[PDB]
RNA sequence: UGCGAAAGCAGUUGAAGACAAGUGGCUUGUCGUUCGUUAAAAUGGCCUCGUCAAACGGUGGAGAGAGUCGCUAGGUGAUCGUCAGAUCUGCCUAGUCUCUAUACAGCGUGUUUAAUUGACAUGGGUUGAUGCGUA
């Protein structure tokens, strides 16, 4: 090609990124779902994962995220940001796992060193769903 | 290369600090004292000189040159033909020009040259002269309208004159003055047909012989330039879409060049079969300077042989008397059919009025191969100045850059702003922040976007690769006052640091791992008040950081990135606040860290906690430089010293369009100036290239430097063989 | 002048859980074959030498699949119990399998009536057979009798090495892939025992605890084993006699494990793990036996296997499941006259001083919405953009470049009714998208600007102007609540 | 240049051994050593020895005795080895070597013979240097190092008995000419203020710089570039920086003239004969951020007043660019001369201080940027006014109006004038957060609540107002809360902060569901005002008329 | 236009002269005219140099598509009916379940961290659109 022409942009295989992924530094309460939980986030059972986490009880999901166990609740959390992430609809009824895994377990994930780097990728689906709030008040007026 | 001011020779001509209206204004390749005999360039200026220089070898130490006896004119051009030279002046009622033609000769006395006289034109709009050079044609403004005449000049053989309303049609009365204004025309080699090249976008041959004319409508805006083939029969076109189009006057069949990296300006047949084509491409994504690229390329293939540029430095303002060209309509990237006197009535008066007259502007030097890096309007120039010529250009936005010519309306987009652009000091990444614009009458138009790229390339290509790119590093709508590349104990010279306006800092650094360059550390603080007047300044043991903010000049650490602590509280001073806002916190060494502000200068050491010197810069920096612009003003060493820079508006017996430029170096904290020196122009950057000098760049952009039997039969035989 | 710049894709910042390489490839193993056999597949093994072909272990009968059919090429029926173990010499040449009387049968492969010797081993279940890696003539079998033994099978009336000392059920062997004379043999108490055989041999050298009763050990470098029983695998330096990973992310016991090298991959190598919950997983090696990909599968797994390291063909992953079934994925992959006349149209300068080139590489084809913005025809961009099977970032990226390149009005105005619907049924599915409602909201908003009469007279735009409405309430809901989740994690910093 | 400052034989042990120090003593029989137990036998003792080394073994140990050779010792098992007499003179301070490291046959008097690590293996004679005042022994290529005060510099390695170098090297009598952390130079010390590195390959100065203060007994740390010295008459070891990839905090050296201070590790207590106390518990010099805190050895501090650009014909100054003036006519004289003017008897009245001010400095009395000031002028004309008589109207007005106050402000609430209040809270540039919360705490019900709201969110960053603002009482954030609620953006993400700051659990429920109803109607309001905002053909067939 | 932060905060928009048109003046409008102020349109758009097919290596994906009326959560309709509720085995959406050449998209394989080969005489002539129906 000619001496005097310019080079073209070209992005490739360039991988585009955001600025918010941190990812560097006798029974009497339900009959509940966290065995099969917890041996989904033990693993990484997508499959099973689905099936626990189609149940969209409210009460269920309540004592289900209270039984569980707080060393697993931060993957969980992040199981549900990533599910969030990619398909846009499950943001509806998935959130409300992601409200109570906070509320329960809210002293686990403030005792955690490194909160935003330990569950990066809620931070930055958040971030990318709320900013452009002013954008469709806008266009909803 | 003959350089000018090499010798006394004609850098007496001009070495002034004032005036460059002395200006060259004609090459001829004979030689006029003694004809029939040519290897070297007789050159006319503007003013009267005729200076006859060898480029053969090495320059001759007294050219051959004269003064012709000339009048208050101030040489047009001239003109050359078999045997005979003719001259052309202009002149001093409505502001127009007034051209008169002047005939030479030379023999008798060999010191002058006599002039004759042939004919006045007393109020010339346009003009232009044919390929050969044999005649000439020019407008007129004399009364309802203007008028056009054509005529011979080396002979008497045709001078015809007509009003240009019998070439204008019926329709442009009741149109437009674009449909009416004309910014072109040419004359072939026998004067028979002619092309007027309109502000509308059209071009009309007229046929001189009976006034007929004939429309060629291409150009969606202004036509620039216009010329002839020898024979007349193409005409090549050029205008603000950056496609150089030939017509076929035969059947008017246009073939393209389309993608030509500037609006041609000029453009014309050049061989004797007229085998080339000579272009002047004005490259007006710049609206701050106009910076031409001059090419030729062969007919043949149409492929660009010997494009010729300087260096594209983007001025933060308007240099000097600079007109960006005409359109059709008024824009950001030119002006309307109107506004060209008010224009420059207006950047007149804002160069002598104003207070923010700081055109200054980055250039970066790779530290592998000291070459220099002008980033333009989204877009790179490299260009190497030990033989200053370009390396080459590089798009490094995606803008509508060069998929287009933009025209009428879409002169008023622009493309992403490059405004910073930084190596890792081991020359291997490229760190670039680019600044997105929307366009304009749309819900996103007051929202900017912030680019973030990290390019690569090994030493033996010329051009980079982009690996990744953050769009809105530090979040949404918030820009990037500065990027710090890191040094070579990080991540072995692989991180940056960027900074906010809010104060916030992101470190970024590549890991081999996740083969990409990502986020590593960050500290954001979340104020409600915003300033444009950070800096940064890293230790060399890659220890601590200094955050230099807008009043406040905060010590952070590297390990825990907050602001820096010792327990045992050893007056641990981690913030010194200024008598005003900081624009650079250059650390010389690990000793000591200068600070320059709106107000003074200070040096602050840290082997003894406390200020060391001061110096004054308000009487000289005062509101003149937008603040963040004295880190490219001042610069350092590694071990020599440091450089202040200040600049003069020189003034009447009020201030001037002049100016003069005061460099001064120190050594080790302030202590002498052991380096004082006056350059007779205004100076925009200087930079310390990594072998103990300092680069500066003029604002006409010269880059200056501050630094420490058988013999007969063999030449008879070169001769009859050659 | 130059050449003209493609239309850049618009790519946005990448969302979580992307798809890795590693994954990529792993994931191209497709087309499912379900076999059911009569009884639970409890060991495979691969043909090393054309390593195109697998011997499963039903229960009494070893079944030789090709790697091209996956159909039963060969069968070996003639076993009077259940046949536990069968693998291949490392020439591919026999193929010996362990039978539940304790009776090495050691055939020819592809020749399942020559039976060429039959070891008698211990009067319990021989549960491993397998022949040397290096050597060829002796062949290690393992039986529930707690002691391996090694014969050499020319003489295969006594065994030549008698490798005693493991107190519960052997169920494994390994060689050491560099030194030739070290077993590595594991059982049911744990205790990855290993011995060298110029030794006594009643005796291991050393000792691997393992924790959990083992039930394979594979020898993945010259140093490393990696041992899997239990919920976990561990690898164990061998010249340090040292653990140094742990992998436990499985529900139930790992029952196999297999390892592949120097194989066309981005992976440069790969243990797979098959462990009795329907999960087969793979683990790079090389950082740090990270897992990559995964399989789930209808029953628990009993045991798997891929195809050797220069398989050349069609590639397998194999897993027989405790079900009784063998699910296998594979990965694919004029006249004389006339020629004396066009002679010389493959010379390509070989015995020439110069060699010129300028014939242009030709680029990808353009698609219609490039060559229309090319060709400056903005309104036929919009309406290639709104064809139905164009992709969610084309259509993005032909909005987008309409929108920075000219202008959205240009592409908008001669439109009327039928010619909008189009625009605005796409940006109802549009405007859920993060990456793509900036350009949905300033397209609509510039959309109702100039055509807000068209939206008085035609009422079926209307009632997508409503469903637009209720869309963007929706969407500012989520936008909304977002924020709040962000704020109740903003109080947990 | 200093570091952490405090604290007023096997050299690579440290404790949990039994005596890997076995050293001798002054004024005593021979030598020594104790525990945190190993024998103390004896290596041929009772000569004139100044120090004592072992061949880091412990049990092969010795007594280092001033008589030409030395002998083994057996400290753990009872057997001895054989030895050989080389010299007959001074072997004080032998040095036994590893396996065929570095060994010769040097006692005090130009002999160096080389030798190896044995009783009977022997090398050339290699005594060809002069009568050297100061041999040390290197590991550059392990290397004999003599400095002699014939004054002249060689070295000579002992690995194939091959002289590297020498010159002439001019040193005087030293007082500790020890060689470098890094072995590559000699860090010899002047008898008061000095310290000099010469290059220990080439025996030439490298770098003669001089020291802090009085100090003695100097020797190199296990550092970079670092040394510790002990004080002569002192027991202060202070540290200086002129064991790179995990460095030493403990055990590096034993060399001091202090009292009894031998075994110097960090915690120095439990000494070999002395039984003595410890001090700084530090590790040896990092890479920059230590000598922040040690920024010692330059105390030398002057007046710092504004300079200008010298003035080389500066008539031709081309268009200055200040309004009117050209530069203030500097008065520094003067300025130490208000001091006199103002500390006079203007006990309550603006008569003699503030027209005192105002005249030296001819400002607008609210304004910067006619500065020429120091900011220790500053501070002491501030403390004359802190003292006998803030009723002055123009200089505690136009100097809160000065980015230098240090740290004098934190009176601000309690002295309590409106304008001078409101006017320390807008533009006093240095201001506690503290004070600044405790006035936004102690809620007086007015628009200065926005005003301190203002500055306390614009100067500091919010972990550190909300660590900070951990620091309140319940009652305070109860009565904050129920003004928010009854009686705004500032104070709308300070609430923000405070139920970010107040914690998790323990809070109450009236006041919550109050907060609740409060923002949710304000969230109502704000999404309408921001809706405003965002807010902000023929037919077939007529009938009409026209003129008759 | 100035100060600014990317928000915003203060300032506006005169005079002379000439010319054109309309009805020597009067009105209106222009200016390759000057002084002062910090101050939309002339049917008129971008070149050839070789395409097609099949791979391969990285990069993204809203995945490209097809089912099961299989589950979870919903939004809603026709007719009758007092409602209760009936039939339409009511429809639509999202998620889940199942499958495919990851079907989708993009950059590259001339040297690159990586990764490419093959077809074709890259012409001329005659019909080819009024010859066509599976709708």
Same mark, same amino acid.
């Given at each position: ?84 992430? !990619? ?55 | ?274 085998? %080339? ?59 309307? *059919? ?149 040094? !070579? ?172 430029? !005061? ?60 | ?6 239309? $850049? ?485 | 240049? %200093? ?76 057997? $001895? ?70 004054? +002249? ?15 002439? %090297? ?52 296990? *550092? ?48 070999? $004969? ?206 904050? $809360? ?25 809070? +109450? ?17 704000? +999404? ?21």
């Amino acid at each position: 090609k000619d001496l005097a022409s310019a080079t073209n942009y070209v992005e490739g295989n360039a991988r585009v990124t955001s600025g918010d992924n941190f990812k560097h530094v006798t029974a009497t309460t339900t009959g509940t779902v966290t065995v099969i939980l917890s041996q989904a986030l033990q693993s990484n059972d997508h499959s099973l994962l689905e099936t626990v986490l189609n149940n969209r009880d409210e009460r269920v999901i309540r004592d289900t995220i209270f039984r569980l166990k707080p060393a697993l609740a931060v993957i969980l959390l992040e199981r549900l940001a990533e599910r969030i992430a !990619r398909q846009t609809h499950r943001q509806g009824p998935l959130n409300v796992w992601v409200k109570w895994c906070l509320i329960i377990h809210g002293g686990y994930l403030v005792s955690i060193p490194n909160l935003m780097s330990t569950l990066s990728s809620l931070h930055s689906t958040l971030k990318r769903r709320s900013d452009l709030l002013p954008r469709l008040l806008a266009l909803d007026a | 290369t003959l350089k000018f001011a090499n010798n006394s020779l004609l850098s007496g001509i001009f070495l002034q600090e004032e005036e460059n209206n002395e200006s060259i204004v004609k090459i001829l390749l004979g030689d006029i004292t003694v004809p029939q005999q040519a290897h070297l360039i007789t050159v006319f200026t503007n003013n009267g000189h005729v200076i006859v220089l060898n480029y053969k070898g090495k320059l001759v130490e007294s050219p051959k040159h004269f003064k012709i006896s000339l009048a208050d004119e101030k040489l047009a051009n001239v003109f050359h033909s078999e045997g005979n030279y003719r001259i052309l002046t202009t002149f001093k009622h409505n502001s127009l020009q007034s051209y008169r033609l002047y005939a030479l000769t030379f023999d008798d006395a060999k010191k002058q040259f006599e002039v004759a006289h042939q004919a006045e034109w007393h109020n010339v709009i346009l003009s232009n002269i044919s390929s050969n050079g044999k005649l000439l044609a020019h407008m007129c403004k004399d009364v309802e309208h203007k008028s056009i005449s054509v005529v011979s000049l080396f002979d008497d053989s045709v001078n015809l004159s007509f009003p240009l309303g019998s070439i204008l049609s019926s329709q442009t009365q009741s149109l437009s003055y674009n449909t009416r204004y004309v910014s072109s025309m040419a004359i072939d080699n026998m004067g028979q047909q002619l092309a007027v090249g309109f502000a509308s976008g059209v071009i009309s041959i007229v046929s001189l012989a009976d006034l007929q004319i004939r429309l060629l409508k291409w150009h969606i805006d202004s036509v620039l330039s216009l010329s002839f083939s020898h024979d007349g029969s193409y005409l090549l076109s050029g205008g603000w879409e950056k496609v150089m189009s030939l017509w076929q006057l035969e059947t008017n069949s246009q073939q393209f060049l389309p993608r030509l990296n500037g609006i041609i300006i000029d453009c014309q047949v050049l061989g004797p079969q007229g085998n %080339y084509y000579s272009l002047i491409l004005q490259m007006t994504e710049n609206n701050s300077n106009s910076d031409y690229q001059f090419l030729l390329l062969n007919a043949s293939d149409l492929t660009s042989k010997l494009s010729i540029n300087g260096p594209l430095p983007v001025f933060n303002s308007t240099i000097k008397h600079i007109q960006q060209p005409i359109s059709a309509m008024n824009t950001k990237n030119s002006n309307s *059919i109107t506004s060209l006197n008010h224009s420059k009535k207006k950047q007149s008066r804002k160069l002598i009025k104003s207070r923010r007259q700081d055109f200054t502007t980055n250039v970066e030097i790779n530290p592998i191969n000291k070459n220099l890096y002008f980033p333009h309007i989204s877009a790179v120039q490299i260009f190497d100045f030990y033989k200053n010529e370009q390396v080459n250009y590089q798009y490094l936005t995606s803008g509508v850059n060069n998929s287009m010519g933009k025209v009428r309306f879409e002169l008023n987009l622009q493309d992403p702003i490059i405004t910073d652009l930084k190596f890792t000091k081991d020359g291997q990444w490229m760190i670039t922040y680019e600044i997105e614009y929307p366009p304009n009458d749309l819900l996103s138009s007051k929202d900017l976007t912030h680019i973030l790229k990290f390019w690569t390339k090994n030493d033996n290509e010329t051009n980079w690769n982009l690996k990744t790119k953050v769009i809105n590093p530090h979040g949404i709508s918030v820009p990037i006052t500065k990027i710090l590349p890191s040094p !070579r104990s990080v991540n072995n010279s692989q991180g940056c640091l960027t900074a906010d306006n809010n104060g916030g800092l992101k470190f970024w650094s590549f890991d081999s791992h996740e083969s990409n360059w990502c986020l590593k550390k960050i500290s954001l603080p979340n104020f409600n008040h915003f300033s444009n007047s950070v800096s940064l300044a890293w230790s060399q043991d890659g220890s601590l950081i200094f955050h230099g903010f807008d009043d406040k000049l905060q010590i952070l650490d590297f390990d825990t990135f907050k602001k820096f602590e010792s327990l045992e509280n050893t007056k641990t001073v981690s913030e010194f606040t200024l008598d005003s806002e900081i624009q650079t916190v250059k650390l010389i060494n690990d000793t000591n860290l200068i600070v320059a502000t709106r107000t003074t200068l200070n040096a602050i050491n840290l082997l003894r906690g406390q200020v060391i010197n001061s110096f004054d810069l308000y009487p000289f920096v005062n509101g003149v430089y937008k603040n963040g612009h004295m880190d490219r003003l001042i610069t350092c060493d590694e071990r020599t010293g440091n450089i202040a820079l200040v600049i003069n508006q020189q003034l009447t017996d009020v201030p001037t369009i002049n100016y003069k430029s !005061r460099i001064i170096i120190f050594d080790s904290d302030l202590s002498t100036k052991l380096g004082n020196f006056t350059h007779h122009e205004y100076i925009s950057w200087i930079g310390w290239n990594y072998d103990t000098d300092f680069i500066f760049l003029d604002i006409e952009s010269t880059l200056g430097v501050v630094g420490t039997n058988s013999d007969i039969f063999a030449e008879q035989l070169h001769k009859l063989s050659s | 002048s130059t050449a003209r710049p493609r239309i $850049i894709t618009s790519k946005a910042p990448l969302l979580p859980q992307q798809t890795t390489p590693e994954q990529r490839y792993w994931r191209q193993y497709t087309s499912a074959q379900l076999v059911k056999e009569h009884n639970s597949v409890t060991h495979i093994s691969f043909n090393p030498q054309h390593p195109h072909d697998f011997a499963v272990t039903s229960s009494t009968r070893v079944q030789i699949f090709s790697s091209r059919t996956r159909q039963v090429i060969k069968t070996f029926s003639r076993f009077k119990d259940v046949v536990y173990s069968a693998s291949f010499r490392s020439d591919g040449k026999l193929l010996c399998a362990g039978d539940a009387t304790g009776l090495v049968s050691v055939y020819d492969s592809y020749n399942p009536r020559t039976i060429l010797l039959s070891i008698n081993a211990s009067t319990h279940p021989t549960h491993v057979t397998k022949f040397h890696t290096q050597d060829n003539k002796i062949l290690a079998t393992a039986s529930d009798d707690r002691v391996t033994r090694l014969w050499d099978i020319s003489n295969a009336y006594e065994p030549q090495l008698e490798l005693t000392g493991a107190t519960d059920y052997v169920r494994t062997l390994s060689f050491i892939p560099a030194a030739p004379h070290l077993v590595a043999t594991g059982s049911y108490d744990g205790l990855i025992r290993l011995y060298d055989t110029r030794s006594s041999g009643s005796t291991p050298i050393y000792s691997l605890n393992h924790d959990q009763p083992v039930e394979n050990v594979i020898a993945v470098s010259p140093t490393q084993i990696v041992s899997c029983g239990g919920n976990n695998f561990k690898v164990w330096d061998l010249t340090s006699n040292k653990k140094l990973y742990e992998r436990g992310n499985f529900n139930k016991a790992v029952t196999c494990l297999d390892y592949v090298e120097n194989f066309d991959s981005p992976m440069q190598s790969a243990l797979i793990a098959s462990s009795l919950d329907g999960h087969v997983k793979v683990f790079d090696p090389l950082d740090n036996f990270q897992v990559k990909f995964g399989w789930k599968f209808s029953g628990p797994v009993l045991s798997c296997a891929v195809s050797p390291s220069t398989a050349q063909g069609n590639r397998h992953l194999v897993a027989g499941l405790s079900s009784g079934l063998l699910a296998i994925r594979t990965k694919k992959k004029k006249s004389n006259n006339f020629q004396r006349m066009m002679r010389g149209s493959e010379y390509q300068g070989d015995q020439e001083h110069i060699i010129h080139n300028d014939k242009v590489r030709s680029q990808r084809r353009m698609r219609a919405f490039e060559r229309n913005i090319n060709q400056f025809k903005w309104s036929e961009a919009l309406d290639n953009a709104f064809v139905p099977g164009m992709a969610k970032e084309l259509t993005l990226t032909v909005l987008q470049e309409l929108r920075k390149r000219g202008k959205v009005r240009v592409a908008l105005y001669g439109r009327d009714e039928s010619t909008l619907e189009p625009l605005l049924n796409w940006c109802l599915k549009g405007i859920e998208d993060v990456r793509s409602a900036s350009i949905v909201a300033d397209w609509v908003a510039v959309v109702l600007e100039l055509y807000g009469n068209t939206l008085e007279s035609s009422p079926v735009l209307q009632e997508l102007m409503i469903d637009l409405k209720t869309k963007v309430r929706h969407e500012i809901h989520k936008s909304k609540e977002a924020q709040r989740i962000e704020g109740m994690l903003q109080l947990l910093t | 240049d %200093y570091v952490q400052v405090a604290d007023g034989l096997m050299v690579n042990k440290g404790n949990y051994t039994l005596n890997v120090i076995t050293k001798a003593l002054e004024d005593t029989t021979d030598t020594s050593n104790d525990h945190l137990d190993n024998k103390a036998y004896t290596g041929s003792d009772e000569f004139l020895s100044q120090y004592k080394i072992k061949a880091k073994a412990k049990v092969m140990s010795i007594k280092i005795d001033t008589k030409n050779s030395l002998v083994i010792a057996i400290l753990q098992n009872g057997l $001895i080895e054989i030895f050989d007499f080389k010299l007959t003179l001074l072997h004080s301070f032998d040095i036994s070597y590893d396996n065929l490291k570095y060994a010769k046959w040097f006692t005090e008097n130009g002999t160096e013979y080389v030798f190896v690590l044995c009783p009977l293996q022997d090398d050339k004679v290699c005594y060809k240097l002069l009568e050297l005042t100061d041999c040390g022994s290197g590991e550059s290529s392990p290397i004999k190092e003599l400095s002699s005060t014939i004054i +002249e510099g060689f070295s000579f390695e002992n690995s194939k008995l091959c002289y590297q170098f020498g010159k002439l %090297y001019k040193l005087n009598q030293g007082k500790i000419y020890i060689y470098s952390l890094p072995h590559c130079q000699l860090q010899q010390v002047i008898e008061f203020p000095m310290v000099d590195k010469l290059s220990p390959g080439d025996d030439l100065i490298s770098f003669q710089p001089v020291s802090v203060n009085r100090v003695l007994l100097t020797v190199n740390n296990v *550092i970079y570039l670092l040394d510790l010295l002990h004080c002569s008459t002192l027991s202060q070891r202070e540290l200086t920086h002129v064991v790179i990839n995990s460095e030493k905090s403990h055990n590096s050296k034993t060399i001091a003239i202090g009292i009894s201070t031998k075994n110097g590790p960090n915690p120095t207590s439990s000494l070999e $004969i002395i039984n003595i106390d410890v001090g700084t518990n530090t590790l040896k010099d990092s890479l920059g951020k230590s000598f922040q805190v040690g920024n010692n050895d330059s105390s030398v501090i002057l007046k710092p007043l504004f300079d200008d650009k010298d003035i080389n014909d500066k008539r031709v100054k081309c268009n200055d660019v200040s309004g009117d003036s050209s530069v203030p006519v500097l008065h520094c004289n003067e300025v130490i001369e208000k001091l006199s003017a103002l500390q006079d008897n203007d006990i309550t009245s603006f008569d003699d201080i503030f027209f005192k001010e105002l005249k030296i400095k001819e400002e607008h009395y609210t304004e910067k940027d006619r500065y020429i000031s120091d900011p220790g002028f500053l501070n002491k004309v501030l403390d004359l006014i802190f003292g006998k008589f803030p009723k002055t109207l123009t200089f505690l007005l136009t100097h809160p109006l000065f980015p230098l106050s240090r740290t004098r402000n934190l009176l601000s609430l309690l002295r309590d004038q409106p304008r001078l209040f409101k006017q320390a809270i807008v533009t006093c540039p240095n201001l506690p957060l503290n004070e600044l919360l405790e006035e936004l705490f102690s809620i007086r019900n007015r628009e200065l609540l926005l005003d301190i709201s203002f500055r306390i969110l614009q100067d500091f960053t919010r972990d550190s107002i909300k660590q900070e603002m951990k620091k309140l009482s319940k009652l305070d954030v109860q009565n904050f $809360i129920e003004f928010i609620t009854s009686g705004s953006t500032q104070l709308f993400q300070l609430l923000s902060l405070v139920l970010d700051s107040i914690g998790l659990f323990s809070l +109450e429920g009236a006041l919550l569901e109050n907060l609740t109803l409060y923002i949710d109607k304000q969230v109502e309001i704000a +999404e309408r005002n921001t809706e405003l905002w965002n807010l902000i053909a023929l037919p077939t067939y007529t009938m009409e008329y026209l003129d008759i």
